[PDB]
Chains A and B, each alone.
Chain A
Amino acid sequence: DILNEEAKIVQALNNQRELTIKMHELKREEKDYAHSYSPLFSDPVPQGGSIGKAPGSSR
């Protein structure tokens, strides 16, 4: 009756250990430009300076 109630607590603590190791993995994982920077306007391509612009200026 007491071995089962200790195995329950050990399972509940190993669950927290797995959760902690997971939530540590999750932060060091790299992340998208749409999640790290603003979601709308998801491309990093600037295309900036649009009045006196030259054709051939893109690459």
Chain B
Amino acid sequence: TAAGISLTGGRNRCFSEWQSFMHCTAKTDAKSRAQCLPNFEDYMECLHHTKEKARLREIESVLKQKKEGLEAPPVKVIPVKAIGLV
């Protein structure tokens, strides 16, 4: 098959989490599968980014209510005309 083949013919974005889950599932028989629950979780949110979307909503809920906003090393946005300007 095309199990882990990416668009360039390499390995896809979640190949390594999947191969860790299959390394799990190779050395285990059933009745003993409840221990490779974390690897599968690591695979699934590799796919869909559910917990990162939850975490970033939790942090954006807090930065919306600050009058201060950001006291940090900030991030700049450039036009595509000006990647290496100065």
Which residues of A approach B to under 8 Å, CB–CB? 30, 33, 43-54, 56-59
Contacts and interface: CB of A to CB of B under 8 A. Distances in A.
A47 B1 CA distance: 11
Interface string B8-41: 1111100111111011011001110000000000
A50 B3 CA distance: 11
B15 to A, nearest CB: 6
Interface of B: 1-6, 8-12, 15-20, 22-23, 25-26, 29-31
A59 B15 CA distance: 9
Contacts of B4: 46-49
Contacts of A50: 9-10
A58 B31 contact: no
Contacts of A52: 6, 8-10
A49 B5 contact: yes
B2 A59 contact: no
Contacts of B1: 48
Contact of A54 (B3, B10, B20, B25): B10
